[PDB]
Amino acid sequence: EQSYVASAVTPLRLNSSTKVLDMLIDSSTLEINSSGQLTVRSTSPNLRYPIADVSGGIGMSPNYRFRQSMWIGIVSYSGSGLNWRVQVNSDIFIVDDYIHICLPAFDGFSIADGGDLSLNFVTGLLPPLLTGDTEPAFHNDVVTYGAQTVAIGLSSGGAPQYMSKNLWVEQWQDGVLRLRVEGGGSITHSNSKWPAMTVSYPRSFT
Amino acid sequence: EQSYVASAVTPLRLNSSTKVLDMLIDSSTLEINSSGQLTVRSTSPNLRYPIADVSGGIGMSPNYRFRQSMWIGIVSYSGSGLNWRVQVNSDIFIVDDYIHICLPAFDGFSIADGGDLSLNFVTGLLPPLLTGDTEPAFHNDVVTYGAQTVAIGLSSGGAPQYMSKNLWVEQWQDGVLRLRVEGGGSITHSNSKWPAMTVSYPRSFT
Amino acid sequence: QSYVASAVTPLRLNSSTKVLDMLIDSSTLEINSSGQLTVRSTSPNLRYPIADVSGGIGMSPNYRFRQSMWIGIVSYSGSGLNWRVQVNSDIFIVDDYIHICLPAFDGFSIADGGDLSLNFVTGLLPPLLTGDTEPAFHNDVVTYGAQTVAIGLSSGGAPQYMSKNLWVEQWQDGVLRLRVEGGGSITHSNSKWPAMTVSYPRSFT
Known about the structure:
The structure is a homotrimer. Chain A folds into 2 domains: 2-43, Ribbon (Laminin), CATH 2.10.25.20; 66-206, Virus attachment protein , globular domain (Adenovirus Type 5 Fiber Protein (Receptor Binding Domain)), CATH 2.60.90. The termini of chain A are far apart. Chain A has one helix at 62-65, and strands at 7-8, 12-14, 21-23, 30-32, 38-40, 51-54, 57-60, 67-79, 82-95, 98-103, 106-109, 114-120, 145-155, 161-173, 176-182, 191-194, 197-202. Chain A is rod-shaped. With 206 residues, chain A is an all-beta fold. In chain A, the strands form 4 sheets. In chain A, strands 11-16-13-14-15-12-8-9-10-17 form a 10-stranded antiparallel β-sheet. In chain A, strands 2-3 form a two-stranded antiparallel ribbon. A two-stranded antiparallel ribbon of chain A has the order 4-5. Chain A contains 1 helix and 17 strands. Helix content of chain A is 2%, strand content 52%. Chains A and C meet through β1, β2, β13 and β14 of A and β2, β4, β6, β8 and β9 of C. Chain C: This is Outer capsid protein sigma-1. Chain C: It is found in: Virion. Chain C: Belongs to the orthoreovirus sigma-1 protein family. Chain C: Residues 58-205 are annotated as: Head.
């Protein structure tokens, strides 16, 4: 005649024997209605935390924006001829890509001109928080991060003498955060009055 | 209503009478071009702050990343007997989920070994900012956040003597931010030289 | 022998060849290797820091954390006193903040009030550039990130630590100026500066 179908270009296909005309569709992205209509299979957007589904729209995960917990653990000082430890109760605040360990004021013993203050995160963290969550973005690299000046009260029983010492995040290894404390010179003493200190550093992600 | 030849499998359908061949399409998901082409319906994704439209593309609202304003208000000290206030002009910087109150150096009066420094945000905040914008993510919980060592000059008219005192964000209550100032020992004085100080803490979002 | 008069779009029957095909918008649809019509997977128009994190929409890890270092000159100037020291500091860009982790160093005399300038014109290692150190407040004079720092002043003997006030004052043409003042002073010729971390919101454009 002057009107019929000889060939059929994909996705269309005409079976040469039965002459049935059908269409090839990718079932993972398309489907056919109960009404026999061709439709697109609705799929939800693929989001990577911190990007998330907030109130139906695409937003920022509130967990990422603010998370709180606390650590009830052992803080230990180590220096030339010295080694002691104190139990401390500190709040933990994870805001964006930063972790903040809010240490309270505490009493310690003698300190050398240079020493290390170690926070043991292997134990003490309130679930669902874990040791791994305290890892810095720079992992276990030795750095001089967040250096700050801190005034510690040194005494031998009498009125304390406040020495200004330099403190910074030095390294995190196997769940133990090591802080370097040094400088300011030293006087003979047996006790120390440490001020409340907030230690912050970029937290490791993904 | 009508009848179609079994030869065209849905979504295709051959009208047995008119012998017109057409296709069934779910209009809510598919449409036909001006060029007669089958196309997918363009969907508009819902974005939730901080995720916003950045020049047609999907990005992070510049408002969330950085905002600047200022507070011209009253800073008041209170410490067992001693009580006084000073007017201060400070810049406010909201960067990501943090608020930064950049207090300038100011002169105050006597201070006790332990006391509170209150910033009154119910008044003095410059638009667009509102008192509510200063609420911490931990809203009114008593904490020991952002503890730091600060050197204050104490004097009685003569050359000042600088005492190292411990300062931290203690609590935010009904628009008033209370900072704890203590430790470091005291000396007899009538005036105090406070250094410029930046108070930072995670800002509330909902 | 099998009449088929007319094919409604997107279908189209060529009256000459009698070939039946379909019109599809290639920007939204495509045809499989298996000859199946499928939805064309395209990525949306994303703006940094929002990136295409392995298949989906995520936050670029580059925005969350980026490290580098500066090997440059730190120079002090105040009431006629001028001097410089070479310093090696780590630089950490986390979110919208830049952190210059300065190490402890030795300097010379300092006045009651002076400026400490970090020259970012040179010394920045990849992927950093001078422009990357610009604050969000550009070259506005501010009193940002004020903190108390203890510097050791000496004349050769045991140092005396004076508590001085320090803050980010201004960034200009690649040079970050820090104000150092207050706390009084004493006669000295040398200074022991402690390690200091300078942080401020980084510019984005």
